[PDB]
Amino acid sequence: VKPNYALKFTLAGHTKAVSSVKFSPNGEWLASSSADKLIKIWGAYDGKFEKTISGHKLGISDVAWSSDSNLLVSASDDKTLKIWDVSSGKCLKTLKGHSNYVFCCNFNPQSNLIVSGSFDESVRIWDVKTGKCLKTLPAHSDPVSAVHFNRDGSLIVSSSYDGLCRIWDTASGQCLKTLIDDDNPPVSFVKFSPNGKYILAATLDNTLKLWDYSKGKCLKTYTGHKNEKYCIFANFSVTGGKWIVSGSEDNLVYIWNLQTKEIVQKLQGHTDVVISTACHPTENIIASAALENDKTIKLWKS
Numbered sequence: 001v002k003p004n005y006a007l008k009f010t011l012a013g014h015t016k017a018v019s020s021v022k023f024s025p026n027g028e029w030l031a032s033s034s035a036d037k038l039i040k041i042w043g044a045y046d047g048k049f050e051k052t053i054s055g056h057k058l059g060i061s062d063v064a065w066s067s068d069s070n071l072l073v074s075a076s077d078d079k080t081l082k083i084w085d086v087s088s089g090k091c092l093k094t095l096k097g098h099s100n101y102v103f104c105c106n107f108n109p110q111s112n113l114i115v116s117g118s119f120d121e122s123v124r125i126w127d128v129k130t131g132k133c134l135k136t137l138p139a140h141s142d143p144v145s146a147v148h149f150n151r152d153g154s155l156i157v158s159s160s161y162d163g164l165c166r167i168w169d170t171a172s173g174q175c176l177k178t179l180i181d182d183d184n185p186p187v188s189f190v191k192f193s194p195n196g197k198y199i200l201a202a203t204l205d206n207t208l209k210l211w212d213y214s215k216g217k218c219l220k221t222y223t224g225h226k227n228e229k230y231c232i233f234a235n236f237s238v239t240g241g242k243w244i245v246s247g248s249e250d251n252l253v254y255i256w257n258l259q260t261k262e263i264v265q266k267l268q269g270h271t272d273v274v275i276s277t278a279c280h281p282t283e284n285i286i287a288s289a290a291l292e293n294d295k296t297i298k299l300w301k302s
């Protein structure tokens, strides 16, 4: 069984490389962030431009939705995160604390906390309501590429150019596990599986790996794409077949069968590295976004 994703919409508006795209949990919206310092909101189903959210002083590298689809958090080279009320467009809080560029961010499932990762090689945990830092984890010895909460929010997984994946106790801040394979390439992305059993990790040796967190073992490897230079998002696609989805530095979107690890589709159309992809929560829809030579977001439907 193979999907037949087909291009439906191309979304133009950002004036520099796109950084990160995410679908709202309620499925209505796509948020994008960009090196152009802007957040843009788009209709998830029609690709129709909705509004621009502005305020960061420098480029934004990541953006993420609150559980109720009402808030965004963004991570920027201005060394802040910003919490946004999407309807009003207002910046509710500016999170100051990192000493270098903030590269990655996420809400916990309860959306009372935010986790962030930075070039200052730390991971910080923030209180959403007060906008204050609760914990600072001396997490890595190189820039942090990704941070993600597990299903009940009790765990944080982080990745770094230092070659490590680490799992942290949210409440205590203690390192619970360090994961690394036979080699030490930079780890450029990590996230928990939807059921929370697994960890999907990208390394800059053109490889994605599915880990059993609790066993601390690599279960699956996904190859065939190009990933040696940039931190490319990866996803679990679950609305139809169970796929792994990733951008690639050959300007394609790759889709693998999660179980068999075979490539089942490649999406062609971007003119630069596909840095970010996202999967719609209820429809077979993928959003993809590319770097400076391209500047567009594309919406594919299977």
Ligand SMILES: COc1cccc(C(=O)N(Cc2cccc(-c3cn4c(n3)CCC4)c2)CC2CC2)c1
Pocket (backbone or CB within 6 Å): 018, 019, 020, 060, 061, 062, 103, 104, 105, 143, 144, 145, 146, 147, 188, 189, 229, 230, 231, 232, 233, 275
């Ligand atoms: C983290 O340390 C590094 C070092 C060198 C390159 C990059 C990088 O991926 N990009 C591309 C890029 C741009 C914007 C956003 C992202 C990005 C953010 N996140 C991810 N990629 C995965 C999780 C969070 C990457 C840098 C761009 C070309 C100048 C990252």
